[PDB]
Amino acid sequence: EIVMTQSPATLSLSPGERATLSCRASQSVSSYLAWYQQKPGQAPRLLIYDASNRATGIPARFSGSGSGTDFTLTISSLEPEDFAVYYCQQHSLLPRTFGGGTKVEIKRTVAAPSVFIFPPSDEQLKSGTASVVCLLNNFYPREAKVQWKVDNALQSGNSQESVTEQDSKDSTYSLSSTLTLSKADYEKHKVYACEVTHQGLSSPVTKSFNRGEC
Amino acid sequence: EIVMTQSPATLSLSPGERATLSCRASQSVSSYLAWYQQKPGQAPRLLIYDASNRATGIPARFSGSGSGTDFTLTISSLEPEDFAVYYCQQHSLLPRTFGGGTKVEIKRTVAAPSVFIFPPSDEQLKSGTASVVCLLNNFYPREAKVQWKVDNALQSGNSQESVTEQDSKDSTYSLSSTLTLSKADYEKHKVYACEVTHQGLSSPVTKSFNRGEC
Numbered sequence: 051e052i053v054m055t056q057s058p059a060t061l062s063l064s065p066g067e068r069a070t071l072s073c074r075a076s077q078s079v080s081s082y083l084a085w086y087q088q089k090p091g092q093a094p095r096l097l098i099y100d101a102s103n104r105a106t107g108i109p110a111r112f113s114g115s116g117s118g119t120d121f122t123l124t125i126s127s128l129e130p131e132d133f134a135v136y137y138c139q140q141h142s143l144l145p146r147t148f149g150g151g152t153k154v155e156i157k158r159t160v161a162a163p164s165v166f167i168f169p170p171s172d173e174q175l176k177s178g179t180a181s182v183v184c185l186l187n188n189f190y191p192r193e194a195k196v197q198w199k200v201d202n203a204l205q206s207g208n209s210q211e212s213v214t215e216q217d218s219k220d221s222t223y224s225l226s227s228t229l230t231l232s233k234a235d236y237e238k239h240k241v242y243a244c245e246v247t248h249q250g251l252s253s254p255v256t257k258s259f260n261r262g263e264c
Numbered sequence: 265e266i267v268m269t270q271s272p273a274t275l276s277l278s279p280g281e282r283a284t285l286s287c288r289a290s291q292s293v294s295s296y297l298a299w300y301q302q303k304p305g306q307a308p309r310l311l312i313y314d315a316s317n318r319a320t321g322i323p324a325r326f327s328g329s330g331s332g333t334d335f336t337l338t339i340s341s342l343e344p345e346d347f348a349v350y351y352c353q354q355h356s357l358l359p360r361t362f363g364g365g366t367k368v369e370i371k372r373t374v375a376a377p378s379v380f381i382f383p384p385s386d387e388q389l390k391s392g393t394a395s396v397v398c399l400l401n402n403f404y405p406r407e408a409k410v411q412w413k414v415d416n417a418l419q420s421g422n423s424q425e426s427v428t429e430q431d432s433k434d435s436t437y438s439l440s441s442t443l444t445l446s447k448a449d450y451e452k453h454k455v456y457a458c459e460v461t462h463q464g465l466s467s468p469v470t471k472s473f474n475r476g477e478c
Contacts, residue, residue, distance in 0.1 A: 240476075262454070262476030 052076040054083075054138050054149045057120075062155035062191065069125035073138030073149050080118035082142035089134040090215055097136070098123065123152075130156070133216075155191070156221040162250030163189035163225065167242065167257040169264055180236035184244035184257060186225035191249070196227035199243035199256065205229070236261065266290040268297075268352050268363045271334075276369035276405065283339035287352030287363050294332035296356035303348040304429055311350070312337065337366075344370070347430075369405070370435040376464030377403035377439065381456065381471040383478055394450035398458035398471060400439035405463070410441035413457035413470065419443070450475065 057072035075083070084105075085098035099105040101116040111127035121138055136152035163186035170180040186194055192213060198205045208231055214224040227244070243258035271286035289297070298319075299312035313319040315330040325341035335352055350366035377400035384394040400408055406427060412419045422445055428438040441458070457472035 260476060262474060 051145065052079070052140055052143055052147055054140055054147050056136075056138060056150040056152050058152060059150070060153045060155060062157040063128060064157045065128045065130040067126075067128070069128050069154070071123040071125060071136060071152055072120065073123070074120040075118070075140060077143070078118040079116075079121075079140050079142065081116055083116070083121060083138055083140045085112075085114060085123050086137035086139060087132075087134050088137060092134075094137065125154075155216055158190060158221045160191065160250045161189045161222065162252075163187055163194065163223075163246060163248050163255075165244065165246045165251075165255050165257045167244045167259060169242070169259055169261070170236065175233055175236075178233045180231045180233050182229035182231070182242050182244075184227050184229070184246065186223070186246060186248065188220065188222045188224065189248060189250050190222060192223050192225075193249055194225055195245070195247035195254070196225070197245035197247070197254070198227065198229045199241065199245055199258070200229075200231075200235075201239040201241045202243060203239075204245075265359065266293070266354055266357055266361055268354055268361050270350075270352060270364040270366050272366060273364070274367045274369060276371040277342060278371045279342045279344040281340075281342070283342050283368070285337040285339060285350060285366055286334065287337070288334040289332070289354060291357070292332040293330075293335075293354050293356065295330055297330070297335060297352055297354045299326075299328060299337050300351035300353060301346075301348050302351060306348075308351065339368075369430055372404060372435045374405065374464045375403045375436065376466075377401055377408065377437075377460060377462050377469075379458065379460045379465075379469050379471045381458045381473060383456070383473055383475070384450065389447055389450075392447045394445045394447050396443035396445070396456050396458075398441050398443070398460065400437070400460060400462065402434065402436045402438065403462060403464050404436060406437050406439075407463055408439055409459070409461035409468070410439070411459035411461070411468070412441065412443045413455065413459055413472070414443075414445075414449075415453040415455045416457060417453075418459075 053076040055074045063069045081101040086094045087097050088094035096105045097108055097112050098114045101121055102114055114123040133154050138149035140147050166185035168183040174180055184196055198209055209227045209229045211225055211227045240261040243256045245254045245256040247254040267290040269288045277283045295315040300308045301311050302308035310319045311322055311326050312328045315335055316328055328337040347368050352363035354361050380399035382397040384396060388394055398410055412423055423441045423443045425439055425441045454475040457470045459468045459470045461468040
């Protein structure tokens with residue numbers, strides 16, 4: 051059970067020069083591991099098969115080194131179709147541990163989320179529930195906060211968030227914490243504010259409404 | 265202190281024939297009392313000075329009889345300018361008791377109030393109070409009810425009503441119970457219904473809204 055530690059946790063790079071990646075082993079694998087291309091929603095694909103040697107139709111730019119503890123994966127000529135979660139994985143020891151995950155993002159600039167809270171529908175009040183949805187939209191990076199305020203009461207646990215993938219078009223993100231409440235706790239209050247703290251935001255943006263306003 | 269009891273309390277007559285009125289004494293006044301024409305918002309005017317004899321410019325139609333306990337006042341040729349509160353008043357005994365009041369209305373037909381509840385303003389919520397105003401409008405007669413419902417709670421005492429005079433034009437009426445509440449008791453509820461029961465109404469009409477709807 052040799053722990054494989056990938057030294058870049060994630061990476062963001064606007065498409066360009068060498069974007070070399072790293073994975074370390076807990077022991078001496080000695081050039082007996084492989085590199086992988088798990089694309090989002092896809093089957094993984096072999097990049098490097100034994101610490102180098104550029105497996106079977108890999109285009110021009112995906113060398114790597116190692117031998118035998120801390121291994122490298124050189125993304126030299128970035129080619130932005132290659133934005134995928136990458137994986138070192140030892141093989142010549144059982145059981146066969148994978149790496150951690152090497153989500154390669156894009157580094158445009160830090161942008162502000164266009165924050166949009168949404169009341170639950172009256173159809174949801176016909177369902178006897180209430181889910182307040184606070185948008186974040188068209189921003190960078192994912193490093194955000196949502197602090198729900200229920201007549202200005204800092205609440206969580208009733209709220210499930212939702213992270214879009216990074217867009218191919220504008221490299222942005224979109225969040226939605228979903229403050230799912232009962233209808234009874236919904237009727238107890240009106241001021242439903244959503245304190246959103248993001249780096250592109252200068253302030254913790256509190257997007258609010260009143261129960262029955264919109 | 266001879267009690268003067270006017271036998272018609274009020275009267276309603278679409279303009280026409282003899283509209284004779286009555287007042288009774290507790291003792292024998294013996295033709296020593298007078299008839300009066302307190303118009304709305306006006307000074308009273310003498311109609312008959314001693315049980316008959318048609319005082320000093322009274323037009324053609326305002327005779328009366330008596331002598332000496334139960335006296336009459338004949339409005340024979342109605343002339344609808346004469347719609348005023350009328351008064352017997354003894355004089356030849358001290359103290360000089362008046363009658364009860366003889367509001368002469370018009371008898372068009374029984375009509376239904378056009379009922380319109382009104383939320384308090386948010387400016388009233390800026391004042392820290394709340395007064396819910398439920399209209400009645402363009403009806404006949406004044407015999408109406410208002411039953412306030414605060415998330416359907418039959419309330420009163422927080423409500424002051426307001427009776428228009430009978431119109432010269434369409435002989436109608438208009439009411440407004442004013443459910444004056446605190447802002448705190450206002451915020452406790454939404455369903456602000458106004459059960460209006462009138463004769464022109466076939467049903468007890470409950471005009472409602474929700475706090476924050478309109």
